[PDB]
Design an enzyme around this catalytic site. Structure first.
Site, PDB file in Angstrom:
ATOM      1  CB  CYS A 119      40.190  27.891 -48.695  1.00  0.00           C
ATOM      2  SG  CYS A 119      41.156  27.366 -47.242  1.00  0.00           S
TER       3      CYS A 119
ATOM      4  CG  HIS B  96      41.274  28.244 -42.653  1.00  0.00           C
ATOM      5  ND1 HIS B  96      42.376  28.626 -42.318  1.00  0.00           N
ATOM      6  CD2 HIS B  96      40.255  28.852 -42.854  1.00  0.00           C
ATOM      7  CE1 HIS B  96      42.168  30.081 -42.520  1.00  0.00           C
ATOM      8  NE2 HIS B  96      40.798  30.536 -42.800  1.00  0.00           N
TER       9      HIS B  96
END
Ligand code: CA
Lengths: 4, 148
Positions: free
Chosen positions: B126, B62
């Protein structure tokens, strides 16, 4: 695709 | 006799580490898959059975707006010609960002695992967080060519  | 690193059963152990000088990043490498349980430690192999010598070693994590030392927050700064280093066991491999692209939030094919002649390191980070749908719309994944 992994990783949100 | 030589070293023989292999993703063991210690799903709890970092299989190695990863860093980039042009991006100024340095983090651990946990065994796939990047499922929540794994992403709890660090950039996990985008796939569970990833190989220590796979034709394409993918990894995902992430991003954090308020943290450049996170998994792949400071990556947006790095780009082509970027020298990438992959440390594992007592061995240090090397890769260089050769290609970069993005795709909708479902193109799992990003794992891109076909080229073998010149192995690679599929990076997956991401971003583009949405606050209306509460999910990440755009996906960022860079491929790197093995050089070591
Ligand atoms: Ca692979």
């Amino acid at each position: 695709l992994p990783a949100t | 006799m030589q070293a023989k690193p292999q993703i063991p059963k210690d799903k709890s152990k970092v299989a190695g580490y990863i860093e980039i000088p042009d991006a100024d990043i340095k983090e651990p490498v946990y065994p796939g898959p990047a499922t929540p349980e794994q992403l709890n430690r660090g950039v996990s192999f985008a796939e569970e059975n990833e190989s220590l010598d796979d034709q394409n070693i993918s990894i995902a994590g992430h991003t954090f707006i308020d943290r450049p030392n996170y998994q792949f927050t400071n990556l947006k700064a790095a780009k082509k010609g970027s020298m990438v280093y992959f440390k594992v066991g007592n061995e240090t491999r090397k890769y260089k960002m050769t290609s970069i692209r993005d795709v909708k939030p479902t193109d799992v094919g990003v794992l891109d695992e076909q080229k073998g002649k010149d192995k690679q390191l599929t990076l997956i980070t991401c971003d583009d967080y949405n606050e209306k749908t509460g999910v990440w719309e755009k996906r960022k994944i860079f491929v790197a060519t093995e050089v070591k």
